[PDB]
Amino acid sequence: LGGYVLGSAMSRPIIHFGSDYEDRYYRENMHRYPNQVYYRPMDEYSNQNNFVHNCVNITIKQHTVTTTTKGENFTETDVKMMERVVEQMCITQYERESQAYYQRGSS
Numbered sequence: 404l405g406g407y408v409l410g411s412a413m414s415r416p417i418i419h420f421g422s423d424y425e426d427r428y429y430r431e432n433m434h435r436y437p438n439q440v441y442y443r444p445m446d447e448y449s450n451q452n453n454f455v456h457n458c459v460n461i462t463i464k465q466h467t468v469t470t471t472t473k474g475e476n477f478t479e480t481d482v483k484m485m486e487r488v489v490e491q492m493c494i495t496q497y498e499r500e501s502q503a504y505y506q507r508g509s510s
Contacts, residue, residue: 412438459489
């Protein structure tokens with residue numbers, strides 16, 4: 404076993420934003436949106452909520468490698484929008500999680 408998890412691409416790349424101003428740039432970022440999510444067993448010593456957020460940090464980290472494929476850099480603004488797509492992707496793997504979100508609304 405290696406560790407690199409794969410599950411094909413994702414449907415509905417249109418992610419929520421809320422910032423009409425950012426939407427402008429999001430149009431160019433959506434084309435380069437993240438289509439790969441990875442996670443290691445090392446990340447499993449905190450609550451269930453932190454586990455999800457952490458998983459997002461892992462992907463972006465390794466992302467630095469593929470970043471060489473295009474030979475470019477990422478800005479705090481670009482990475483921010485990309486971090487939003489990664490999260491939604493983590494849940495895409497298992498809809499069972501989102502199923503709980505729909506039911507009830509206790510915060």
